[PDB]
Design a protein around this ligand. Sequence first.
Ligand SMILES: NC(=O)C1=CN([C@@H]2O[C@H](COP(=O)(O)OP(=O)(O)OC[C@H]3O[C@@H](n4cnc5c(N)ncnc54)[C@H](OP(=O)(O)O)[C@@H]3O)[C@@H](O)[C@H]2O)C=CC1
Ligand code: SF4
Ligand code: SF4
Ligand SMILES: [Zn+2]
Lengths: 111, 376, 95, 126, 96, 176, 114, 75, 208, 292
Amino acid sequence: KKTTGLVGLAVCETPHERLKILYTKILDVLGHIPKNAAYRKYTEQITNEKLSIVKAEPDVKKLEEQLQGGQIEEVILQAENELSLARKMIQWKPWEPLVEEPPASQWKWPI
Amino acid sequence: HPAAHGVLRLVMELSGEMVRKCDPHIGLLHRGTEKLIEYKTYLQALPYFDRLDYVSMMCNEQAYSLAVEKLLNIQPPPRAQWIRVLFGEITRLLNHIMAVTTHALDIGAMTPFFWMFEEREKMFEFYERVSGARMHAAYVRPGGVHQDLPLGLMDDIYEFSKNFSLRIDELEEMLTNNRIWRNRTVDIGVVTAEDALNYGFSGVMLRGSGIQWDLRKTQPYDVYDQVEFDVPIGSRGDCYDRYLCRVEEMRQSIRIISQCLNKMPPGEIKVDDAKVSPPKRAEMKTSMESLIHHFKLYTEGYQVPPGATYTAIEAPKGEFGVYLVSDGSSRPYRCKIKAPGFAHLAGLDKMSKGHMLADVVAIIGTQDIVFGEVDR
Amino acid sequence: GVRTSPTGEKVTHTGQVYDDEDYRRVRFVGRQKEVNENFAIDLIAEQPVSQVGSRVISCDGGGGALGHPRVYINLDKETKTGTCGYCGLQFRQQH
Amino acid sequence: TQLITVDEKLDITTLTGVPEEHIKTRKARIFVPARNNMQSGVNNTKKWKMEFDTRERWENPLMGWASTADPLSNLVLTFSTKEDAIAFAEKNGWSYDVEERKVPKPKSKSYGANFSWNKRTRVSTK
Amino acid sequence: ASATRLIQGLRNWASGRDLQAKLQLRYQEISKRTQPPPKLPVGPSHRLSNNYYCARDGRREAMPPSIVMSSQSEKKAVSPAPPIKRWELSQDEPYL
Amino acid sequence: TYKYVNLREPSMDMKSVTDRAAQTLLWTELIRGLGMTLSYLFREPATINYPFEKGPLSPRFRGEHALRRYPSGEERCIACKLCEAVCPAQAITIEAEPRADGSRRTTRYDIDMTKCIYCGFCQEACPVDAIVEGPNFEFSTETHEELLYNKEKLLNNGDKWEAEIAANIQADYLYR
Amino acid sequence: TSVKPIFSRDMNEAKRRVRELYRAWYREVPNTVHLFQLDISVKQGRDKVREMFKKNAHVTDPRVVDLLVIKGKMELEETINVWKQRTHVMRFFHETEAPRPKDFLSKFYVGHDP
Amino acid sequence: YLRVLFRANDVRVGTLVGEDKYGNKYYEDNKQFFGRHRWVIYTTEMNGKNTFWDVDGSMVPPEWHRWLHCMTDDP
Amino acid sequence: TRPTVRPRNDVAHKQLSAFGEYVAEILPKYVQQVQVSCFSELEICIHPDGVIPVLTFLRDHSNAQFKSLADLTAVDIPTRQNRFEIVYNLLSLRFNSRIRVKTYTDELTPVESSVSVYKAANWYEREIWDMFGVFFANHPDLRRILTDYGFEGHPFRKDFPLSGYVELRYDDEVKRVVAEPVELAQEFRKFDLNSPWEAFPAYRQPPE
Amino acid sequence: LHHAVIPHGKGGRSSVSGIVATVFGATGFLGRYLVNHLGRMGSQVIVPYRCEPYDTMHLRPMGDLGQIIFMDWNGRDKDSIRRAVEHSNVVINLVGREWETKNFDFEDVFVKIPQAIAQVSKEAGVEKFIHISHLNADIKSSSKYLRNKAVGEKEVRETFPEATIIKPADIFGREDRFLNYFANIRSLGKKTVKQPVYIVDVTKGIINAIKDPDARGKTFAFVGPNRYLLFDLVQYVFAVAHRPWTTRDKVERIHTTDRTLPHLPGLEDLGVQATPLELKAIEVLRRHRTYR
Ligand SMILES: NC(=O)C1=CN([C@@H]2O[C@H](COP(=O)(O)OP(=O)(O)OC[C@H]3O[C@@H](n4cnc5c(N)ncnc54)[C@H](OP(=O)(O)O)[C@@H]3O)[C@@H](O)[C@H]2O)C=CC1
Ligand code: SF4
Ligand code: SF4
Ligand SMILES: [Zn+2]
């Protein structure tokens, strides 16, 4: 289209296929992640639900309507930043058991 | 420096009239307000929130009183809500006209300063007639508005709103599609909306650069749910468009004040709890419980349950945040202020990377910095 | 009225008038040591103490919210006049 | 990354930059502010107050006010225990004197003990 | 007021604003001060016989904070708050 | 509801482009700006001449910090110290003494005018309306010593006018 | 108390970083005392620099020594720039007496003092 | 006339509300705007300080101070 | 009740409890407490070793944007093993929700300086270094802001008193501004305002 | 000693010391720096002036809240002097204009002014009246200045004999006069030995003399330890400066001498450290264009 809203937002010529190949890379990098962590469960659920929304979308305006969190390249930016954290979530191993104890009366407020 | 609105030390390590770096050193106006409110009580330290931001004399009072009410689980009566929203838009009008005026002084533009400060003299006469103060009206006790308006205010608000619509149209006649003011300030101060999110910018910056975001129509914290208006959003960067955003917020503020005069109920001044607000004179001079509540409310202050709360209002500079930490006590433990002036000041170098010093002055001008609010 | 200290000046209504070798006197050089010549005790002596026919009476001070809150004093003992704590003026009874 | 531990105190006494007389000479006092006897109720208890020794307050030579040369006169540090009080005092540097906590001993009292046939508790007016 | 008609014609000739109409000289539009004094009533209280402080004691109902996790096949993943739908264009003259 | 601005393409009609070219060549709305400057030139200014035509005020204005006394009576203050308890800059310094008869009164009553921040909390808290925010504003001092007040200064300052303060309170007693 | 470090794993890098700091302060004096137009010899300023290093002899923990090196590096930044001034450098000097005593006899006559 | 020609500027006598002891003159008009209703003319040597020149504020008595700062509508 | 008492929400409280439980499940590595008060703003309370991971996860993961930062404050509390409290406060753009991210720390152990994911926190981190002492490793510039240059002490502590240890005046002996030990002109008469009789019975900790 | 005259607390900024000072002169140089050290000490300074109030406003920011106080006098009256010395613990006399006005000569200022004020000072029962004097004030010729100050020494020793006469040498400082005349240039060859003394060691000796008894009666001297020649000092002052209403009583003074007197004690006997002229000369040798 022409004259989009935001400043740092310049959409591509074919948004749907870019968003699809973003979400296939999401499913791939999530495929690196082990199973028993809940991160895989919730992210694969939400990305397969959003991709299943997108698979029946021929029109850009119709996808901006039905998918919530629009309009178009805000969704793409959301996807790109989710991909970047997934690449970081191979690292840091954040599904470990709980790190060690507080003083156990630290959060008792009225002191 | 006179273009330094207030004081702002600025070590600009430049290449000649076309820079390299600039560093805003602030803290020259540091006063210790957080430590002072740590060593005071609530009602005794409310004038710190008069004096912190020294333009929004009613908005920050609204912010702190709603912080105490949101902590304290108390709804004020709706007449005080309508009057507080009325003065919130009035002080919003005063803040927008000071922003236009200080940008006019930072850009040149000598006379609209004088025109709109005659109008702001009329504004100050209104504050005098209401609260008895010149420029720092406390007037907003936590627990509803105390010492309400007399007969002889709404007439002046009506006639002044008509005159002010005429005067803002005359300001759009003089400036606002002028040739060389526009050619002076369009092509400067562009910030990408992704980074306008992630530099912590708020309010008018997020208006003018991209995103659609208003705390008023997204979060009802007062009687804003019953009034109707519209707020301008920015095309693409372009400080000229930010100026147009300020002017249209002014005119829509006049529309909100017209609606609020259309919807004013004559119910009551303060809350129905003498353990929150002090009683009035007849009950003070006759009834026993009123004198006991008066005396202990002005010695100790009302006891406040412990809680670490935060709230934020849509001040005309942006997301004015007040963060209270209250022990079960009569003194709050620790309070802090999120300043939109501080947030907009944080991106000064990035707004002024590839320009000259004249644009550095105009980017100080494009954001109504006051630095009492920035200091904490 | 003002009295006469040995310094030849005006004393105060509460006893803070200077000694003869205080150098605060010599920082009062050439300027008015200001004093309110009307004193508080000088008006009570010209008060007609009224004679109310009840037993325990009221005092407001000329209209509510212009004065002091309602204080209630007693007229039992005929050897002592009933003195208000706020008004500073007495009351009596007759029968 | 699992660095070594040592059986030492903490040494912020030159990190905070307070002058040396106010470091050494201020003999602190940790105490329980007990029940204000003209009032009633021990709500103001349970909070260990670390406070400091007082020094001179002289006459202001124009108004008779109490002008002081004391930064450390109006401090009140609110604690919950005694071990953490000792830990904070060893952490920041100064010395201190310690009061105990003197709870009210509960005594057996009864109106049926206020009255008796052969004991000498006799109110004789109620 | 109190001006000649030629300079009024020049004021209209300079710009189409009709400066005679609203002129920034408030003459008698201000309400005449020292009116008879108006009374200030009391709203939803001060009636007798029912208004307990036991009922409307919202100050003493400040609840302690409710907690979940600590140190002490799921069709899920909701948002903290519902996604608010995108706003409306202006009725009276947007661009466009 | 949002109303976003600066969205146009320039209309490429011949009439539009010749009007905008004439605007570029003649500086036309620059001359319109000059017309606005003349339209405010031929007004009359809303100034006041300072000693002879004073600016207006409000009944609730807060100046002099005077003291009232009773109607044909003595000092209205009790030294109940609520004004020190609510004075936020602690400018109220009160050390009381009972007088030579027994009724509780003062010795040292001090409003530190260098510290006063003109709220009216001492006006609210004063249970007899003894301390009153004064009406006028001429302190205007060539010294520092003459700023700090005392009891006899404030009572001489309250003996310079009473019916002023009584008139303002009689105007303002229903509201506050 | 297996505390995270700051800069050093033991006292060796602590002594190395503080001696590098003192090296920078020795080569930092003449430029600043010629630029700021002071009234004091180079040797007197260098002796107050080494005196301020002599004040902190009882500092033991590696966190604290590294934090003193951090403070010294921040102040050397603010003095290699002219963010600070002549007032601050003359405030490091203690010239305007203040001749305040230490003898118990002079703590006794000029008294109300420990 | 040189009195008022070099006092400040005015020639606008013509309403004549009154005067007060110290001789000072007080004139209230309705024909002008709100701000020049009530104006004051200061006399000469009202307490021997030659107050034709170097005129002070609060050489007025306080009842005219309340009247003249636009707090009431009647003298 | 129906007037004069601020009405509480229900479904927003339910959703924030669900979202806090969601976060607490899906990060088992850095979770100690999640809590909601009466006015329904979410609180997460964190061990100080996963600060950048929690902020990256709370910037993205697409069911929590939270792109706006506030205040950082390490609010000083005595008596504890860990005094200082870093308090992040985040607002989302697509959601209209508010979270507080409170991680705890002591006087010397640094944290990882999350400026690299939020550029807003740069001057905030410099300011809280100047006022508290919570040192920030992996950070570009730690200068001093809101303080004098020659002044130190991190004066927002409860150890540094209300008036300072420093005073400035002028002398003409050396024609400049000098410092002195402080000399107040008034006492600052501190007001004892600790009332008896159990101000709030609902917040009674177990007595020792 | 009366109550609230006793000393209190740490020094400076409301430290109500055991002195109540009454200073004459002080609109000029040495008395202004003396009031500077008294406001550093924190006493009440009564000072009169007959001049325009600029210099007394200039010395207003010196003392604490409302401490110092100002009045008026002239070289004609007695009542104003008595009003100055009504209640004074200590009192000092600096006076003297270094040129002849049309009504005050070098005659009768040092004759008529210290007589009346020192007489009413003894008639006010004060302790430790201090009066300045130049070094080598002799009855010997070629010095109107020094012979009138010697007559002043004679008068002050006659009435109230146990007054503290203080004689320093020439005084170099921040706003010096003779060293300004040294700098005031644009061909002459002479010699005379000379040694000056620094102003803050002088005024520390003054305050030690005014609050340390065993000092009365016997006069004191305050000379720096220099003891060299005028030509070396001209070379010194022009090497530091980097250059290649006035009377000739000035040139008589700077070509007189600086000789010592071993009868009276000085710096180390009174107990204040003497500083040489090096870095203070570097201070007071400004105004040069680009060598700094
Ligand atoms: N090294 C030494 O021992 C020397 C000592 N002195 C002495 O030390 C003091 C300061 O030295 P110097 O710099 O030369 O001079 P100053 O200008 O510092 O001081 C002279 C003072 O005398 C006052 N004075 C003189 N004549 C009159 C008068 N007729 N009526 C009123 N006031 C008068 C001046 O008042 P105002 O300015 O207001 O008119 C001024 O305050 C003097 O008393 C001087 O005699 C001087 C030179 C060398
Ligand atoms: S509040 Fe009023 S009555 Fe009470 S001490 Fe103050 S002035 Fe006196
Ligand atoms: S107006 Fe405010 S600052 Fe002034 S005396 Fe009253 S309470 Fe204190
Ligand atoms: Zn009474």
